[PDB]
Amino acid sequence: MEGLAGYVYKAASEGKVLTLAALLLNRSESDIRYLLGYVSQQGGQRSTPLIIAARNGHAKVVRLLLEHYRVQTQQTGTVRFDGYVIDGATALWCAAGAGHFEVVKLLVSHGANVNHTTVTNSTPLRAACFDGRLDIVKYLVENNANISIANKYDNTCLMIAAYKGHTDVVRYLLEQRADPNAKAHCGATALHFAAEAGHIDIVKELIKWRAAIVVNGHGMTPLKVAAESCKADVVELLLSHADCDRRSRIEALELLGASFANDRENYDIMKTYHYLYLAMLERFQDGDNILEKEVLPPIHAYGNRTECRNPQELEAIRQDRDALHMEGLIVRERILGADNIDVSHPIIYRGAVYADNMEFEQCIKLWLHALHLR
Amino acid sequence: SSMEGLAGYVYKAASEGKVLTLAALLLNRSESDIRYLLGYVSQQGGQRSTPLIIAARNGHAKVVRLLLEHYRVQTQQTGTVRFDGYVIDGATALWCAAGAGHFEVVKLLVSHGANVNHTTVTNSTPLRAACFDGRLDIVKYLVENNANISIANKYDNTCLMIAAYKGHTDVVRYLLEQRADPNAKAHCGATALHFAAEAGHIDIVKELIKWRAAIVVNGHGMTPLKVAAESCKADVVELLLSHADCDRRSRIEALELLGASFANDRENYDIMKTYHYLYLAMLERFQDGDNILEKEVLPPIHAYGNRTECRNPQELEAIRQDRDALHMEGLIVRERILGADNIDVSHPIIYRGAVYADNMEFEQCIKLWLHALHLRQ
Amino acid sequence: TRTPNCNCKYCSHPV
Ligand SMILES: [Zn+2]
Ligand SMILES: [Zn+2]
Ligand SMILES: [Zn+2]
Ligand SMILES: [Zn+2]
């Protein structure tokens, strides 16, 4: 704006440190304090000169405001990234999020709170782990940043680090004795996020650190989450666990084969029958106590077809994709449960495919079943 | 591959800002060794970069200064970098520093003669990268150092366009002050005014108008006013309708499209504003009783309840209290005004279907979704 | 989301 505070904030935001110092020459101490403490709202962000300088990464302005003018570090504001809007963020949090290492060093060395909390209860360490900046993460942890402070959804730094796919920061956090068995608000752990996103090496590192297997709020396990998301590599890598019983192994194999059938950007028709037949042959290995599948009653939306119970039926439908699509749908409805969110969308996708092919009544019955499930 | 490990250590020191470690590693090495260590394209975290590129992307100004002043690093070496989710191919250290907002690194690279108008694979410039973020300081510094403001990208998108869409009013005004063409057209024909109208950036719309930006019809058959009406930008429509160089049928079409779009928008639902704008348009059709501007209503379709759009103020008044009738009228008007062009007009239809489904009207939901899928060819 | 290389909502680019 057009006040003296306006030009002060403008110089601090544009990195013009000489201009700022000149604007603050021969003034009283309280005047300089008031001028540098003013919160200015522009560009969708309300921030102080120190905060905007930290966000924009102007290390010279930050050093001037810290060493010379002794600006408070606890000042908070609202910063705006391209994706989100964050309230109650200190200059240190903004610097950690935007990836300005020198500003982070300057603020931490001048006593800024390394464990300041956003309104989302997000530490600057969580911002650096979201960004994937190993340097800032290591610097903060080495300066007593609390690794165990999660956001308002109990999402720890390890969880977001594993979901975003930054393997190195996951290795570092695990070596820093971060609890791998933390559970979020929805009961999910870091391994669930690693399996959902399909990051193989992060799953390897989590298994190396003896990540305790557990169910989430929807009842899913990392194996089930990986099988539902068609992450076949994750399933095959995770099946090598010791506590993996035969029942859950066959369940995961069948769920993966079924999910391969009606996933739009994962439609591998071959792998559907591959995994279904593999799980069937594993069920039919020993012929004294064949772990037989408790099949569900038929449904009209699937052509009244019942799930295959013996290898002969599977190899009978091998060359009929329409039937294989229906088989994947019924196996998903059996394994995931009748009341789960991620059950309806493959049904609706197959219905839309039928509608495009002009199979209108098939599409209509599939959509009716899907809407009843919703 | 023994030197390859030293190259990896050099990359690590550069990426983590250990300028003393990097200086120790590079000191007194042979010229061939220096070239191999500083030109080694390391792949890490989905990014492919040299020590200079990764130091510039992370903002390690001391490392950048060392590499530039004491080791003659190629200022134009390119790589692959990942910004949040998206990836950029053929990016230089200067482009990375501009996109990340590292002003000191931008200065250091420009002062050493870095090609300020380098283009990536999508033909993105450092000026465009800085305009995306909205860093007016970096935009000024680049423009002053001979950064060509008129270089478009893969889809003929300009810095003015990207700044107008993201809401960077200061950047937009600065670019217009630096003689940037406000009437530049994208590959489809859309303009910066088109982009600012859809995003509801009222100040950027005002600024582009002050610099005499022309109203043009893009390849989708839409004016900035028409785009603002489709996107439920009531303030932008009110502003553009105050511009005298719009005809009566254009005003009525804008009012009708705005009112209809207010009825089936997931995030902008307002039934009162729906009826308000629809009734205003209908009233303005029936002014001069001699010369009524009759509307050519489309024949009915089954998915919209076989309803026909109101032709007269009394027919429109009849459905004022019928919420379902107003929703269907919105869908009908949107199909009438937009269906003749290549526009994905299906999102409000899908939303209405889902709303019907949550209230157990599965038959009507399926009818709507079937018609929506039918309209996509 | 939309492709950042073209801000036109009415285009059909492969993200
Ligand atoms: Zn959950
Ligand atoms: Zn949750
Ligand atoms: Zn377009
Ligand atoms: Zn386009």
Closest CA to B365 of B321, B301, B298, B304: B304
Query: What is the three-state SS of chain B?
Result: CHHHHHHHHHHHHHHCCCHHHHHHHHCCCCHHHHHHHHCCCEEECCEEECHHHHHHHHCCHHHHHHHHHHHCCCCCCCEEEEECCEEEEEECHHHHHHHHCCHHHHHHHHHCCCCCCCCCCCCCCHHHHHHHHCCHHHHHHHHHCCCCCCCCCCCCCCHHHHHHHHCCHHHHHHHHHCCCCCCCCCCCCCCHHHHHHHCCCHHHHHHHHHCCCCCCCCCCCCCHHHHHHHCCCHHHHHHHHCCCCCCHHHHHHHHHHHHHHCCCCCCCCCHHHHHHHHHHHHHHHCCCCCCCCCCCCCCCCCCCCCCCCCCCHHHHHHCCCCHHHHHHHHHHHHHHHHCCCCCCCCHHHHHHHHHHHHCCCHHHHHHHHHHHHHCCC
CA distance A154 to B88: 33
CB within 8 Å of chain A, chain B residues 28-87:
44-46, 58-61, 84
Method: X-ray
User: C-alpha dihedral over B172, B177, B180, B181, to 10 degrees?
Assistant: 90
CA distance A136 to A105: 9
CA distance A136 to B17: 10
The answer to whether the beta carbons of residues A290 and A317 sit under 8 Å apart is no
* Residue A46 main-chain phi, psi, to 5 deg: -105, 120
Residue B9 Rama label (left phi>0; alpha psi -120 to 50; beta) = alpha
Instruction: Give the number of the ligand closest to the Cα of residue A185.
Output: 2
For chain B, how many residues are written?
377
CA distance B312 to B331: 18
Q: Does C6 count as an annotated binding residue?
A: yes
Which of the 8 DSSP states describes residue A24?
T
CA of A186 to the centre of ligand 1 (A): 4
CA distance B155 to B164: 16
Residue A215 Rama label (left phi>0; alpha psi -120 to 50; beta) = beta
> Residue A178, Cβ neighbours under 10 Å: how many?
20
Coil, helix or strand at residue A293: coil
Asked if B131 is an interface residue toward chain C (Cβ–Cβ < 8 A), one would say no
For chain A, how many residues are written?
374
Q: Which of B86, B161, B188 sits opposite C11 (nearest CB)?
A: B188
Q: Does B365 count as an annotated binding residue?
A: no
CA of A115 to the centre of ligand 1 (A): 26
The answer to whether the beta carbons of residues B117 and B96 sit under 8 Å apart is no
For A256, A268, A319, the CA distances from A315, given in Å and listed in that order, are 18, 17, 8
Domains of chain A: 1-146 (1.25.40.20), 150-217 (1.25.40.20), 243-374 (no CATH)
CA of B24 to the centre of ligand 4 (A): 49
CA distance A124 to A89: 9
Chain C CA closest to residue B163:
C7
For A107, A308, B255, B265, B320, the CA distances from B273, given in Å and listed in that order, are 50, 55, 11, 12, 12
CA distance B356 to A289: 49
B163-186 core/surface letters (b: 16 or more CB in 10 A; e: else): bbbbbbbbbbbbbbebebbbebbb
Question: Would strands A40-42 and A45-47 be described as parallel, antiparallel, or unpaired?
Answer: antiparallel
CA distance A170 to A353: 40
Closest CA to A45 of A68, A75, A77, A18: A77
Packed helices B51-58 and B103-111: angle between N→C axes, nearest 10 degrees: 140
Which helix (H) or strand (E) covers residue A170, if one does? helix A167-175
* Residue A123 main-chain phi, psi, to 5 deg: -75, 160
Question: In sequence order, what are the beta bridge partners of B3?
Answer: none
Closest CA to A35 of A20, A46, A45: A20
CB within 8 Å: C5 and B186? no
Token reading at B147: 């950064």
Q: Give which of C1, C5, C7 to mutate to test B binding, by max B Cβ within 10 Å.
A: C7
Q: Which residues of C touch B194 (CB under 8 A)?
A: 8
Token reading at B311: 């032709």
> Residue B59, CB half-sphere, CA atoms under 13 Å: how many?
26
CA distance B104 to B97: 9
Q: Which residues of A touch B15 (CB under 8 A)?
A: 134-135
Residues in contact with A72: Cβ distance below 8 Å, sequence separation at least 6, in sequence order: A37, A50
Packed helices B93-100 and B103-111: angle between N→C axes, nearest 10 degrees: 150
CA distance A295 to A308: 9
CA of A343 to the centre of ligand 1 (A): 15
CB within 8 Å: B195 and C8? yes
Torsion sign over Cα A256, A258, A261, A264: negative
CA distance A314 to A254: 12
Burial class of residue A218 (count of CB atoms within 10 Å of its CB; 0-12, 13-18, 19+): middle
* Residue type present at position B177: E
CA distance B15 to B57: 9
Q: Does C13 count as an annotated binding residue?
A: yes
Token reading at B303: 């998915």
Residue with tokens 């990359």: B11
Q: Does C8 count as an annotated binding residue?
A: yes
Residue with tokens 């194999």: A253
Closest CA to B38 of B2, B11, B1: B11
Q: Which of B122, B161, B344 sits opposite C7 (nearest CB)?
A: B161
CA distance B102 to B124: 17
The side-by-side arrangement of strands in the sheet containing A40-42 is A40-42, A45-47, A77-80, A85-89
Chain C CA closest to residue B133:
C4
For A3, A41, A49, A50, B85, the CA distances from A24, given in Å and listed in that order, are 13, 21, 13, 14, 41
Coil, helix or strand at residue A200: helix
Q: Which residues of A touch B44 (CB under 8 A)?
A: 168
CA distance A163 to A175: 18
Chain B CA closest to residue C2:
B86
The answer to whether the beta carbons of residues A244 and A272 sit under 8 Å apart is no
> Residue A323, CB half-sphere, CA atoms under 13 Å: how many?
13
Coil, helix or strand at residue A57: coil
Burial class of residue A251 (count of CB atoms within 10 Å of its CB; 0-12, 13-18, 19+): buried
> Residue B39, Cβ neighbours under 10 Å: how many?
14
CA distance A273 to A148: 44
Closest CA to B260 of B208, B295, B217, B289: B295
Closest CA to B54 of B84, B81, B85: B81
Coil, helix or strand at residue A302: helix
For A123, A125, B40, B267, B317, the CA distances from A373, given in Å and listed in that order, are 40, 41, 55, 25, 39
Which of the 8 DSSP states describes residue A264?
G
CA distance A314 to A273: 8
For chain C, how many residues are written?
15
Q: Which of A15, A101, A374 sits opposite B59 (nearest CB)?
A: A101
Question: In sequence order, what are the beta bridge partners of A57?
Answer: none
Token reading at A102: 């020198």
Give the minimum alpha-carbon distance from B185 to chain C in angstroms, rounded to a whole number: 11
Residues in contact with A353: Cβ distance below 8 Å, sequence separation at least 6, in sequence order: none
> Residue B346, CB half-sphere, CA atoms under 13 Å: how many?
13
* Interface B:C, Cβ pairs < 8 A: 42
First to last CA, chain C: 7
> Residue A327, CB half-sphere, CA atoms under 13 Å: how many?
27
Residue with tokens 């402070």: A149
Coil, helix or strand at residue A88: strand
Burial class of residue B281 (count of CB atoms within 10 Å of its CB; 0-12, 13-18, 19+): buried
Question: In sequence order, what are the beta bridge partners of B86?
Answer: B83
The answer to whether the beta carbons of residues A102 and B59 sit under 8 Å apart is yes
Q: What is the resolution of this structure in A?
A: 2.9
Token reading at B288: 């001069």
